Design a protein around this nucleic acid. Sequence first.
DNA 1: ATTATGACGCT
DNA 2: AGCGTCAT
Length: 430
Amino acid sequence: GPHMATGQDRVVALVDMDCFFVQVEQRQNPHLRNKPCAVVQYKSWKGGGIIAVSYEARAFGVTRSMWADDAKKLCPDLLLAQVRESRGKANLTKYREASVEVMEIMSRFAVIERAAIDEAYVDLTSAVQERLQKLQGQPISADLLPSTYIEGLPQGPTVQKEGMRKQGLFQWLDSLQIDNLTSPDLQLTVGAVIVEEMRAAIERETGFQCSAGISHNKVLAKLACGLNKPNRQTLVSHGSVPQLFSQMPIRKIRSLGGKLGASVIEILGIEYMGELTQFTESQLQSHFGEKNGSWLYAMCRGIEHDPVKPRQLPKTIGCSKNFPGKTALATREQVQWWLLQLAQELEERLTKDRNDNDRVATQLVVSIRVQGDKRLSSLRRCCALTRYDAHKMSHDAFTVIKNCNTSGIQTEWSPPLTMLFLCATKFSAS
DNA sequence: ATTATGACGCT
DNA sequence: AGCGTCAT
Ligand SMILES: Nc1ncnc2c1ncn2[C@H]1C[C@H](O)[C@@H](COP(=O)(O)OP(=O)(O)OP(=O)(O)O)O1
Ligand SMILES: [Ca+2]
Ligand SMILES: [K+]
């Protein structure tokens, strides 16, 4: 009891831009605003591949990884915006730059960890302490939480969505004011007030809307964020965990959506995260390893200690192109021309990164896929990255991969290559 | 022919 | 070092 950790020491948020690439395109082109629309890359094969979908289009069943020609069958009036193509490949610069806009705003409020192009974790513990000092015992008004859901509420003894949201918020605040909750619950509530302010600043200063989760750790904040999308935020308290986890499929928890989660389900014969509480820590470690077992034991009780890392910039800068089916690269000249295209994009991005961020990459990683191999990468080799020069990088990448060509004819490449990837890594200050 | 990324773990 | 997993 009095010595059992409860993982309530931090306030962590996860902010996730709504349908991010779509919003970037809708800001630029007002004709796309408030419409079913999607972002596509390429166009020739089946209309292009959809990579982002507005909520209006999701209502018709349009999803990521769908061909645009197929999405048009579900939604004939679907509008499309195409990712820019440069040097023969998709170029994501517009979205990376829009991401920097949002990350820089978030950084004014607290330390952030860039989790993805449109996702960041926020460690709000210190900001919450400061705001509590400012509040000076003053109650928190529902007006400060206009887009917040309290997971699990309302409960106990309105048929519209917003009505339910307000009922749950009122129950939560009523119990905080009466002193029937805990200090961690108050800390989370102040965290949610700050996240409302952060999200309002993002929308004011960029036009972009987002969703957010507020809880005591990264996994719960991530889970919380997805509960009420789009343009809403969700507070998951420690006390909400048993009910929330009691019907939560294991695959919904970050890191458990793949083979490990499937093995947890199969080996233990369970379905929901809460069912993990019935195993000892040693049992879980025996099946899933020391690290995973301790993580699962704490996580199923709502406890996780992974820190929000102070990192706003990506740690690698990479450029990749697939060459599917009949387009697989089958001559040496083809391989060299495409390595050059990739290296030219990489050089441009690296030179900009060095000027903006006072750092230089020192390692070049070259990865390829051969036709027939089921794995995304068939081979990875590294070499020194000593000059930001596209011809040198493309020649070096060729040097490190040239021995993979089985073909007895030097001019021919076999087996054909279905993917090329260049990645700059190992940054040092400059 | 579900593409272009990006972080992190294992040995 | 090179490979594998998980995720957006
Ligand atoms: N598999 C992918 N391939 C290519 N681009 C992707 C992929 N997944 C995500 N992206 C890009 C497009 C998305 O706009 C952006 C953020 O991804 P993600 O958060 O999963 O979805 P989303 O922002 O489009 O919608 P949501 O509102 O559900 O968050 O990253
Ligand atoms: Ca998103
Ligand atoms: K995201």
